[PDB]
Design a protein around this ligand. Structure first.
Ligand SMILES: N[C@H](C(=O)N1Cc2ccccc2C1)[C@H]1CC[C@H](N2CCCC2)CC1
Ligand SMILES: N[C@H](C(=O)N1Cc2ccccc2C1)[C@H]1CC[C@H](N2CCCC2)CC1
Ligand SMILES: N[C@H](C(=O)N1Cc2ccccc2C1)[C@H]1CC[C@H](N2CCCC2)CC1
Ligand SMILES: N[C@H](C(=O)N1Cc2ccccc2C1)[C@H]1CC[C@H](N2CCCC2)CC1
Ligand SMILES: N[C@H](C(=O)N1Cc2ccccc2C1)[C@H]1CC[C@H](N2CCCC2)CC1
Ligand SMILES: N[C@H](C(=O)N1Cc2ccccc2C1)[C@H]1CC[C@H](N2CCCC2)CC1
Ligand SMILES: N[C@H](C(=O)N1Cc2ccccc2C1)[C@H]1CC[C@H](N2CCCC2)CC1
Ligand SMILES: N[C@H](C(=O)N1Cc2ccccc2C1)[C@H]1CC[C@H](N2CCCC2)CC1
Ligand SMILES: N[C@H](C(=O)N1Cc2ccccc2C1)[C@H]1CC[C@H](N2CCCC2)CC1
Ligand SMILES: N[C@H](C(=O)N1Cc2ccccc2C1)[C@H]1CC[C@H](N2CCCC2)CC1
Ligand SMILES: N[C@H](C(=O)N1Cc2ccccc2C1)[C@H]1CC[C@H](N2CCCC2)CC1
Ligand SMILES: N[C@H](C(=O)N1Cc2ccccc2C1)[C@H]1CC[C@H](N2CCCC2)CC1
Ligand SMILES: N[C@H](C(=O)N1Cc2ccccc2C1)[C@H]1CC[C@H](N2CCCC2)CC1
Ligand SMILES: N[C@H](C(=O)N1Cc2ccccc2C1)[C@H]1CC[C@H](N2CCCC2)CC1
Lengths: 852, 852
């Protein structure tokens, strides 16, 4: 047997220094890498550059995220490496746009989007005009570059869209049909504004700001909480991309929009950030098994004259109710328009999130809003029976639909036929690309006859459904991953896991005659990529376990003999890594064949200065919930630097991707359907025991577990289920009662509470307080006091029952925090307390000495 | 030098047992001793009993508080000791009135009154009729005993006052003029009800229950938060004690009432008890320096016919506004009527609470409410100019007015003269009794002339002001202590501190020719007493440090030669102590001459089995705020049993009454005016050092401090000011920012925030987070999560700043608790955690071992 290693026992002040010192040189890495790329052709045969790329980035730390451009040359010196100069697009020389001073609406949107970046978070572009449009702080701004106006050689003054609106304007979008017009949201209604004429018009009259929210529960053009939190949809209006000309010389613009009524959604109260007020803000929060918002589509029809003045605005609604036309639909997951504007589209889910359908909605299906019951019938009867919704695709699953951003509609060959690419895990269990052609036939349902439509009545038959990709690996379509379709060469570029579940790579394949899938990115790195709209360059942001993130540009060509075959050449560097981080030792990726049938992957951080014949305390860092993969071949020295710190003090650090994790397919993900909390710890312990039999340095008598969010949830489950294995559990922002979490997440993974009584019971820590230990110095709870996603009541109710059960707990609250750490001092305190708790209760000599 | 004693290091489970075991036999002592006595004469010359006494009590543990009676015999066997039988007044044989299931209104009233007793909390009696009236749970009940109807020999069925009111009825009171009528409060309005006819009528229409409280801020007949919390006034309506006869054969009844408007009072949100709702209740909470409620007096005039039917109700208001008539008055502290009903009285304070005035208010000063501006003038002009308020007494102080319940009005000899007894600390600095005669002259102010009255215009001159008592000791007049006036013998009975600041005693003295103050209670015990209305018996609830509370009845007589001289004879026991509690060692009272000029008193609990040549860890239990005295000659083995437990484990336990404490006079109490937090710890440390020089067993390297409420406040101040002395601080429900505490308390002791910027700063822990220690295991915060008095934000804001400052803390929340512990499991957990924290961080070997 082996001697236990005890960590050096630092004071709280000493640990504060140690932590500060190791973060000092490491301050550069808090800075957004170049993103939101767009390529624009120069079309200058005499000039040296083929393209100008535009992107968002920070030049350094303590500096705002802004628009830059770089110049792509026609030719390169292949002896050398081209570093592209970042030229700032905007005049920011003694001129800041975003300070950190956010409205409530911005604060919340930042939580929902998970963005911590100051400045421009995104932008719109209109290629015909060269018009950029972006929100930055209070203001909405525009500049022109890359259109007929030409290419600037110097930074541009951002032009403020002026306003009479009193409150923050949100979600600005350029009209693709007319770039003089923008729309935005203000106090939950849609407005438009002309950036030349300065004319500004409110389109929807659904919310009064002066009313208190308990009465005034309607909104237009904006996505409600669950859409933002659980479906990554932040906008609820979409411009029609074409204008109908009028005989007068004018035009008609159209905005499709979601109108929401939250009246029957339950109201909770979250503590207001201004703690001194001793008040609480109301939120509409659909808890599991309760009402989601009443939703419908509406359409705004905007008549413009010959010289851009608004003649009239006509608010239109669906000819029959949403619930009749789209039987069984609970959520509008996505929406848009077809490229030529003939039809609006939407991707629609049922409440259980096991049925997806894609529906085309003609504008002819909307009529003017008319309270007058006589002229309303005239309007209804005038719309022909042949005009119905068209369900172009419908799919089901025993597990769940994962919503993604892949959907590409080709130009129409024929009036009665639509051709598109979609992705799905429902055929094979892995997300793949399918080219689908649907027939747009007149429905058997005729409104005139005065009945309601039967469920199948709007289903379009499928002419062809060809699989473009296939295999035991997924195409990526969520969280920034998407496709790029080259309609000339008839190819589709996409990101996937074909080569490895630990690396994302860029692939290309024919959509017309699909076969060999060609990998474009180099093995040994994981890549996040985007492809020029012209399909002749791509950019890869890439790293691996040993090497920090770089961003490089690659040129695409094909050989003379085969235009389908695509090849790559390095062109230039956009961002270099500046070596490997000093005093960072990366982990080793390991794997083990589980008794569950699956290979499971993990990361092991060995203790630094590992003495032979000693056994070391062990810390299991965990997330283990859906939509996340911790273990992959990416640089972990930025986001997970403190795992390396733990290792440096003498902790073994372990991370395992249990079943339920991302990037292993739907069957793998599906392992915990109805069963959250019941399976994940078995995987964690199995991985832990694999390591322990292989490596005698792991002291199994001193294992700790720590996680945030689903990680905190599981940290509690570890302690409750397996007190024999886990000595301490440090749970951050856990769910302790699934009945208090929301509809969109909870019902997806656990179903309705009445149809899973035991799953809800067993998955709910707070129902099981008696199962916690009766020894102190094992349970530490952490929570953001202002958290509106995971309410603090998860913790307060757990404590309520721990107190009744006579069980000890330790507790830390971060009173300025929600479901995130945004105040640096909060993070500093957390890290310090964590290291101190581990030292005193797991790792040190004194920890061992106090265990009776 | 001496060897340190280390406490035995128990596990959490072992400590849970130890604590449970020591509380098992000790369960009897959670039971209300007999109180709310009333003596009624039998007037039966042939019978064996002179009186029947009625009182409230519990027969045992886990049983409701109810009405009992006992029989006082004409004669006793003086060889023996008479134990009076407790005969239950009510039929409760298979019949419970109060369960623990309270409305919000009851929950809050119980917090304000500080009552933890289930059942009848109080009762009314009408001596003419024998009618008892009392609320118990939902219901209002009545029974008859002791009037013309006679004396029951068996328990009575309580008769429910029936109702059509939907919601809890509160604050029932019998009309003294007509015991067929009661009044009560329902949804913040005054109602009356006839208990014979069953007629029920709403009198005020000031609150709509269907409205939400942010709009609907008015109330009638009820005391607002600050009155209840800070002035011990729970009712806001008072029946006129006489009926005016009408020529029809009917009568007029009158209720004076306070009408409140809380519209401009700030609204806070407290977490709702039903934690699962994830909601928060609105409270009107006047924080320091902000608006108190707009108050006025109103009067309800109720015309009854010959056979008890209401003819009409006329709501009347003051002829001129309250703010004009009572210039400078902020608070209505007390109100009532003169014994014959000619005048309403009120005791009125200014905002600074340094000016008291007593004012008589004629009913002629109220006119009908009339919106119509013509008939309103007719009504105003009809009231003669000579009718004004009469300020019969006015007093000021550099320190503060302490409100008390002493005020006795004699019957009028003469129309233009009023004679009364009041108490005051303003003349001498100690509360004494004064007989005052004031002249009721017509005021120089005449309304007709159309001006506003000058401040002095309603002041009555003082004919005589004779001091009845005097000296360096106080008469008691708050929290149950009052006087009893014998108008025949011309004597006044009162409780006081004349013999000792550590013992309360009963005294008697002449009010007409005052001199020798005669003590009636025996030395060596502290007494709480009440005197028969007939002034020939009293009852004393008495204890001392060695002996639990007893209740005995004493007969009063005077010798033949001198009816002024009063003497006492033991008659009977009501409650016996049942010996001394086993395994309880009481503390020794000590004292020391402070460098501040004052003698300070303390209690020392020596460690049990005190080994010679060892030094022991020391725990300072503290309150140290105003209105409380911890150190006196009373039995501490019930409320402070865990101090004895600490002593049994090996802690030295110390309690000191620093300056600011009760029962030492106003100068003593005044020491911290403007200076709360600055002086109390100096006294505590001085007492601690007195003990340490005298007793070598006190280890000054291991001192802890613990308190609740003001005690928790001071525990934080100890750690912040004196980290050299106090190793650990366990602070329960502290104020950390005086700006968040209320008007009535905070401004009394600390003035307005603008006029005491430094005092507020220095007294506010949360402004001084940088002054806390940078070592962990020293600060433990405890708080009731639902606390509406000391909001949880005191703790959450402190933590906010501790986190920014990088300072460690420990935290425990009691999620089912307010500013009290009412759920037994919460108390169990608290006691357990406390002992464990002290063991691990102060007292044990492991505590000493972890101090680097
Ligand atoms: N920082 C401001 C700015 O740059 N603004 C540009 C701008 C664009 C659109 C809408 C508003 C604004 C204001 C102004 C710069 C000049 C400054 N003076 C006072 C101190 C010395 C100089 C006043 C503020
Ligand atoms: N943050 C902006 C800024 O500082 N700018 C500097 C600057 C320099 C060159 C070109 C454009 C700009 C914009 C503006 C500050 C004033 C603000 N108002 C909103 C209502 C009250 C104040 C609108 C935006
Ligand atoms: N709504 C979820 C959430 O915030 N949860 C809090 C929480 C706490 C305990 C137990 C379960 C949960 C769920 C989040 C949805 C987005 C997802 N992102 C990960 C990488 C891309 C997508 C993370 C989870
Ligand atoms: N009586 C059961 C129980 O108490 N159980 C304890 C227990 C412990 C471990 C494993 C299984 C069990 C079952 C369950 C109570 C809820 C009930 N629902 C049906 C209608 C609505 C409520 C279903 C059964
Ligand atoms: N008796 C219930 C149970 O054991 N269930 C098991 C079970 C299994 C399948 C389906 C439903 C169920 C419910 C729960 C036990 C914990 C209890 N708390 C409230 C007071 C403190 C503890 C809530 C009820
Ligand atoms: N960036 C994350 C963060 O700071 N979070 C705070 C927070 C608050 C509420 C809900 C979720 C979250 C996640 C952290 C990533 C690294 C991890 N380290 C701890 C010691 C080892 C590595 C902690 C989480
Ligand atoms: N498996 C544990 C162990 O060996 N540990 C080593 C160690 C070192 C540092 C911090 C924690 C730990 C836990 C032991 C389990 C039984 C326990 N008994 C004490 C009272 C009765 C039960 C003692 C600990
Ligand atoms: N406990 C109740 C009571 O004593 N009441 C007296 C009383 C007085 C005023 C207003 C309401 C009431 C109800 C009733 C006793 C008889 C009981 N039966 C059903 C189970 C077997 C017997 C029903 C309840
Ligand atoms: N707590 C009371 C009781 O139990 N009593 C027993 C009892 C026995 C003899 C004489 C009087 C009494 C009163 C009554 C229970 C029913 C309650 N209602 C209010 C609205 C809904 C229910 C009114 C009071
Ligand atoms: N309103 C006060 C309160 O609750 N406070 C909470 C608290 C916490 C920290 C610092 C100061 C304070 C004041 C209480 C008023 C009544 C008083 N009683 C004691 C025995 C009879 C009268 C106790 C104090
Ligand atoms: N400038 C002073 C300060 O900052 N001080 C720090 C400090 C520290 C220890 C001891 C004394 C002091 C004084 C105070 C700031 C508030 C100010 N008020 C007057 C008008 C409203 C605000 C009065 C002075
Ligand atoms: N600078 C102020 C001060 O020192 N004062 C002393 C002083 C003396 C007499 C009268 C007024 C005053 C105010 C306070 C220091 C603590 C600070 N907190 C906010 C951020 C965290 C810390 C609030 C202001
Ligand atoms: N009856 C009091 C109580 O339980 N309180 C709870 C509580 C909660 C909020 C605000 C004030 C209070 C007071 C306790 C009296 C005895 C004391 N013991 C602790 C160990 C030594 C003796 C503790 C206080
Ligand atoms: N006066 C303290 C003492 O002697 N204690 C005995 C003891 C035993 C049990 C629990 C607490 C205590 C405190 C010592 C003060 C200085 C401190 N240094 C360590 C790092 C630098 C400063 C050590 C403790």
């Amino acid at each position: 047997k082996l001697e236990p290693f005890y960590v050096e026992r630092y004071s709280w002040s000493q640990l504060k220094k140690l932590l500060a010192d190791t973060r000092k040189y490491h301050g550069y890495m808090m800075a957004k890498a170049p993103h939101d790329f767009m390529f624009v052709k120069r079309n200058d045969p005499d000039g040296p550059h083929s393209d100008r790329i535009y992107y968002l980035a920070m030049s350094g730390e303590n500096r705002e995220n802004t628009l830059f451009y770089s110049e792509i040359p026609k030719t390169i010196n292949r002896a050398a490496v081209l570093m592209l100069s970042w030229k700032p697009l905007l005049d920011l020389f003694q001129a800041t746009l975003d300070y950190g001073m956010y409205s409530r609406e911005e604060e919340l949107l930042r939580e929902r989007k998970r963005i911590g970046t100051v400045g421009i978070a995104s932008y719109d572009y209109h290629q015909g005009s060269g018009t950029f449009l972006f929100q930055a702080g209070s203001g909405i701004y525009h500049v022109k570059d890359g259109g007929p106006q030409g290419f600037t050689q110097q930074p541009l003054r951002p032009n403020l869209v002026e306003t009479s609106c009193p409150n923050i304007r949100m979600d600005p979008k350029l009209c693709p049909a007319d770039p003089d017009w923008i729309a935005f949201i203000h106090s939950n209604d849609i407005w438009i504004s002309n950036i030349v004429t300065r004319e500004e018009r409110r389109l929807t009259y659904v919310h009064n700001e002066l009313a208190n929210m308990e009465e005034d529960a309607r909104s237009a053009g904006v996505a409600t909480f669950v859409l933002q939190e659980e479906f990554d949809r932040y906008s609820g209006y979409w411009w029609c991309p074409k204008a109908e000309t009028t005989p007068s010389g004018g035009k008609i613009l159209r905005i499709l929009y979601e109108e929401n009524d939250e009246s029957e959604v339950e109201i909770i109260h979250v503590t207001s950030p201004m703690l001194e007020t001793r008040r609480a803000d109301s939120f509409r929060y659909p808890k599991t098994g309760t009402a989601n918002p009443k939703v419908t589509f509406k359409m705004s029809e905007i008549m413009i004259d010959a010289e851009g003045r608004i003649i009239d605005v006509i608010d239109k609604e669906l000819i029959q109710p949403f619930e009749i036309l789209f039987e069984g639909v609970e959520y509008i997951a996505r929406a848009g328009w077809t490229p030529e504007g003939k039809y609006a589209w939407s991707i629609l889910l049922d409440r259980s999130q096991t049925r997806l359908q894609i529906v085309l909605i003609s504008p002819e299906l909307f009529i003017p809003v008319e309270d007058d019951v006589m002229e309303r019938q005239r309007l209804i009867e005038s719309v022909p029976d042949s005009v119905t919704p068209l369900i172009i695709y419908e799919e089901t699953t025993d597990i769940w639909i994962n919503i993604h951003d892949i959907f590409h509609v080709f130009p129409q060959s024929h009036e009665e036929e639509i051709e598109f690419i979609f992705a799905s895990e429902c055929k094979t269990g892995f997300r793949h690309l399918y080219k689908i052609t649907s027939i747009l036939k007149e429905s058997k349902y005729k409104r005139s006859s005065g009945g309601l439509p039967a469920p199948s009545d709007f289903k379009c038959p499928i002419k062809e459904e060809i699989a473009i990709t296939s295999g035991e690996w997924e195409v990526l379509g969520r969280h920034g991953s998407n496709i790029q379709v080259d309609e000339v060469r008839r190819l589709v570029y996409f990101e996937g896991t074909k080569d490895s579940p630990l690396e994302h790579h860029l692939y290309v394949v024919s959509y017309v005659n699909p076969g060999e899938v060609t990998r474009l990115t180099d093995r040994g790195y994981s890549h996040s990529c985007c492809i020029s709209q012209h399909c002749d360059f791509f950019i890869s942001k890439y790293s691996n376990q040993k090497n920090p993130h770089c961003v490089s540009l690659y040129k695409l060509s094909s050989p003379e003999d085969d235009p389908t075959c695509k090849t790559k050449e390095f062109w230039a560097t956009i961002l270099d890594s500046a070596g490997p981080l000093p005093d960072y030792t990366p982990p080793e990726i390991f794997s083990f064949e589980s008794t569950t049938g699956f290979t499971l992957y993990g990361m092991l951080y060995k203790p630094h200065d590992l003495q032979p014949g000693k056994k070391y305390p062990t810390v299991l860092f965990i997330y283990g919930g859906p939509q996340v993969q911790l273990v992959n071949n990416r640089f972990k020295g930025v986001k997970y630097f403190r795992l390396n710190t733990l290792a440096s003090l003498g902790y073994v650090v372990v991370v395992i991707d249990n079943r339920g994790s991302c990037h292993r397919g739907l069957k793998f993900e599906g392992a915990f359907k109805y069963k959250m909390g019941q399976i994940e710890i078995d995987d964690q312990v199995e991985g832990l025991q694999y390591l322990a039999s292989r490596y005698d340095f792991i002291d199994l008598d001193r294992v700790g577990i720590h996680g945030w969010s689903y990680g905190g949830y599981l940290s509690l489950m570890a302690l409750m289920q397996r007190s024999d294995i886990f000595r301490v559990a440090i749970a951050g922002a856990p769910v302790t009662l699934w009945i208090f979490y929301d509809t969109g997440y909870t019902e997806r993974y656990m179903g309705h509470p009445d149809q899973n009584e035991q799953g809800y019971y067993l998955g709910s820590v707070a129902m099981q307080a008696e199962k916690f230990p009766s020894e102190p110095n094992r349970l530490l709870l952490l929570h953001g006091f202002l958290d509106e996603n995971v309410h603090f009541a998860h913790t307060s109710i757990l404590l309520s029952f721990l107190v009744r059960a006579g069980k000890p707990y330790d507790l830390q609250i971060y009173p300025q925090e929600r479901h995130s750490i945004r105040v640096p001092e909060s993070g500093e305190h957390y890290e310090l307390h964590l290291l101190h708790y581990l030292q005193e209760n797991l790792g040190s000599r004194i920890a061992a000495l106090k265990v009776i």
